[PDB]
Write a protein that binds this ligand. Structure first.
Ligand SMILES: [Ca+2]
Ligand SMILES: [Ca+2]
Ligand SMILES: [Ca+2]
Ligand SMILES: [Ca+2]
Ligand SMILES: [Ca+2]
Ligand SMILES: [Ca+2]
Ligand SMILES: [Ca+2]
Ligand SMILES: [Ca+2]
Ligand SMILES: [Ca+2]
Ligand SMILES: [Ca+2]
Ligand SMILES: [Ca+2]
Ligand SMILES: [Ca+2]
Ligand SMILES: [Ca+2]
Ligand SMILES: [Ca+2]
Ligand SMILES: [Ca+2]
Ligand SMILES: [Ca+2]
Ligand SMILES: [Ca+2]
Ligand SMILES: [Ca+2]
Ligand SMILES: [Ca+2]
Ligand SMILES: [Ca+2]
Ligand SMILES: [Ca+2]
Ligand SMILES: [Ca+2]
Ligand SMILES: [Ca+2]
Ligand SMILES: [Ca+2]
Ligand SMILES: [Ca+2]
Ligand SMILES: [Ca+2]
Ligand SMILES: [Ca+2]
Ligand SMILES: [Ca+2]
Ligand SMILES: [Ca+2]
Ligand SMILES: [Ca+2]
Ligand SMILES: [Ca+2]
Ligand SMILES: [Ca+2]
Ligand SMILES: [Ca+2]
Ligand SMILES: [Ca+2]
Ligand SMILES: [Ca+2]
Ligand SMILES: [Ca+2]
Ligand SMILES: [Ca+2]
Ligand SMILES: [Ca+2]
Ligand SMILES: [Ca+2]
Ligand SMILES: [Ca+2]
Ligand SMILES: [Ca+2]
Lengths: 159, 158, 159, 158
RNA sequence: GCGGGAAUAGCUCAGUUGGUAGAGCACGACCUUGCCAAGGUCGGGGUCGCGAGUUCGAGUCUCGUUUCCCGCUCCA
RNA sequence: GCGGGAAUAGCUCAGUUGGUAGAGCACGACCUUGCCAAGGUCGGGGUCGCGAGUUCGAGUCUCGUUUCCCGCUCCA
RNA sequence: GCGGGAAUAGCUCAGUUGGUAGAGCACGACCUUAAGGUCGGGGUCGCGAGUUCGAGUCUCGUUUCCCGCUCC
RNA sequence: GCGGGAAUAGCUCAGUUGGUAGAGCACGACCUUAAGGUCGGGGUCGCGAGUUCGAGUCUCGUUUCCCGCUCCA
């Protein structure tokens, strides 16, 4: 049983029953996702359970900057300071749907959206802070490369 | 002039002059290189039926801390605040007064609205290079920071 | 099973019952071992089943020389031509005793004997002709190093 | 009169050695000790009664000779090549000629070769005679010249 | 932009010297009793990134070009 | 003997323009629900062979010295 | 491994159809003008067995050395 | 989210014990040297409802904007 294609979070999605195992991700979804969509703090995208409005996973994007000091030499080569980036702020899949490949589908939609964004505005890389080791390996397998200074911070270059 | 289009190796930037040399040399030296590195997106309007650039603006993702941000900008916001930086905006002196600067800024602001549908963006932010530049941006809605007086913001009505 | 320490082949040792899996080696023992010991073509040393004359393993030594062309530059540095060597001509273990580590013990006795001999007469290295590739790996594992020309010819320099 | 044979070392004084054959003497002085270290030869010297001045020496090294240069006596029922010990060097300082020192050196060498042939296959001792005096000397002590190379002689070991 | 390093088999690499193409893993087949695991062998796959040059001879030396990596430079 | 190269963690190795040390394997602990083989993580681990010298500052440059390697030379 | 030869005086060798072991050299001595010659001594025929009236000699076995070929 | 403020003429604002809607700037004509002066025009008091004899004013609901704090490992 798969799920729908990603769609912007709205006031109609039921997020109350969402649990990812990571308290920060779940609490963020339930408390601030929609409010931020209104506030311009982030853009959230959800996939729902087949033919429901119950969210099975989500990712959130926001513009960002990384200082040269906290960036790897590869990233900062011939770049302004700070370096322009897009922050993959949140990426979480309900535990009930782990293994069905929802995280990989979400990350794929996110990367595509970041490409489309980069056509219009300067973006050196996508940046994520992995919350767990499972998360780090997830991102490393899908092309991301950990930092040298902060080893749980990963980047993916776009061009 | 032409309608806005991405910078490419084909645009004539060698004779571009805006009165701020930093902007002109930025165009000529880094516009395209940054286009390649993903440090900025530059858009130019040209002298009709030429590849001669008459004006441009550059966009880049960014963030501003709550301390350098106005309270309207940081209201109920994470830290830092996600923004799009109007990194560069210049018009050749040959085209001053025709209202081209406002057209450039407008195209840029629209592009940021379209972007804000896909990614979190609280405001457009610019570092005004002169007092004229600061006044221009204030005339088009921007509001100076309280801390840094040449940093101005323009909020995006979602 | 358990065997005595190595001793010269003689007319008292039962070599008719030797089987090692290698037909050349077994036929060599049975046909030429004792006569060559008499003729000085080789010196053979055997280990027997403690309290038997049944040969469980043997090695045969004989002087030799190798030309600069088949010698590695390490071997030939500042050396006459040919190079003086001692030839590990034969080394085989009876099938009843494989796995008991007897081949390595024999090789150890042989190397010791060559050291004692090099005390009296110039010897640059021990040289052996590996009969199998497994044998080559055995000798490489115990310190031997293949030549550049023939990889089944291996040397061991003496201290 | 001299000491009993002993291995060459950095302590033996060989600069004053003269045997009449310059090749042998220069070999002693230039290569004896280095070859002792390299495993190219094992050298043994007899000294001048409580000195480190060498009066004579012989050098041994393993070797093999092909059947073509072997006498039929040497190759009878033998592999090819034939394993031998090479008496590479044997020389007496002229100051001790006639005293029978060469025979004593050869005898010590032959004994050492017996003791070696106990441990490793050795068909014969082989020497390359440099002069006719030398060839006849080796022939007098039992050696037998080759059929092909007339300056190469063999001595079989019982 | 300046400097340095890299590019050799599907992957990871070795190749000091200017002198016949390499190893481990992967793949096809075979060997060990008929399958076969471990060990071994055979085979496919390389204009040694590409191109030009010196030499009797180039992975090796020379030059041009492509790409990647690492340090520094830098646009608030 | 002439020439070239090397020595950096228990092992195999990187280390840039002279600006205060790193990787893989190995080791101790943890994850794998626990334990266990594989995999992943965290962590500890160096007079950069030795000595001297230059320098504000040495893994880096100079010299000496110990050891090893590669090419050539060479004693039928 | 196959094949062939040798063993007799200190040395080199002879010893036909089986009948006490021969010649030169060498060695000791002598003759005279170191040489040549003469004189003198030494075997038991590698070993063992057998045939024979009788064996250096023939039969068989064996020891040692040598030569050609074979060969890992 | 907690707290505070704003909305009345084109603009800046007043209209406190609740009574046809007020001043300045600005706008049109005119006086004179385009500033000053004179004259003239413009609302329906953010919206809706309620109390009141009567609501710009009081009560409640609501719309938009603004300020301070809070905040997203
Ligand atoms: Ca659930
Ligand atoms: Ca112009
Ligand atoms: Ca058996
Ligand atoms: Ca002298
Ligand atoms: Ca470069
Ligand atoms: Ca590759
Ligand atoms: Ca390489
Ligand atoms: Ca080569
Ligand atoms: Ca078969
Ligand atoms: Ca192949
Ligand atoms: Ca090809
Ligand atoms: Ca090429
Ligand atoms: Ca390639
Ligand atoms: Ca190619
Ligand atoms: Ca040519
Ligand atoms: Ca080549
Ligand atoms: Ca190049
Ligand atoms: Ca080491
Ligand atoms: Ca190194
Ligand atoms: Ca340092
Ligand atoms: Ca020092
Ligand atoms: Ca450094
Ligand atoms: Ca040095
Ligand atoms: Ca015979
Ligand atoms: Ca006799
Ligand atoms: Ca005789
Ligand atoms: Ca005869
Ligand atoms: Ca006479
Ligand atoms: Ca007589
Ligand atoms: Ca007798
Ligand atoms: Ca008779
Ligand atoms: Ca409020
Ligand atoms: Ca109004
Ligand atoms: Ca107003
Ligand atoms: Ca007011
Ligand atoms: Ca009223
Ligand atoms: Ca006016
Ligand atoms: Ca007035
Ligand atoms: Ca109204
Ligand atoms: Ca009423
Ligand atoms: Ca109210």
């Amino acid at each position: 049983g798969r799920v729908t294609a990603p769609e912007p979070l709205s006031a109609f999605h039921q997020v109350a029953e969402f649990v990812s195992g990571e308290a920060v991700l779940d609490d963020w979804l339930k408390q601030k996702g929609l409010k931020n969509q209104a506030l311009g703090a982030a853009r959230t995208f959800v996939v729902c359970k087949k033919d429901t409005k119950q969210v099975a996973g989500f990712y959130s994007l926001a513009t960002g900057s990384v200082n040269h000091t906290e960036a790897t030499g590869n990233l900062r080569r011939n770049m302004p300071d700070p370096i322009p980036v897009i922050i993959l702020a949140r990426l979480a899949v309900d535990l009930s749907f782990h293994g069905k490949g929802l995280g990989a589908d979400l990350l794929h939609d996110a990367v595509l959206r970041c490409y489309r964004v980069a056509e219009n505005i300067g973006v050196r890389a996508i940046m994520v802070h992995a919350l767990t080791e499972e998360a780090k390996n997830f991102f490393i397998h899908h092309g991301f490369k950990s930092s040298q200074t902060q080893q749980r911070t990963l980047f993916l270059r776009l061009p």
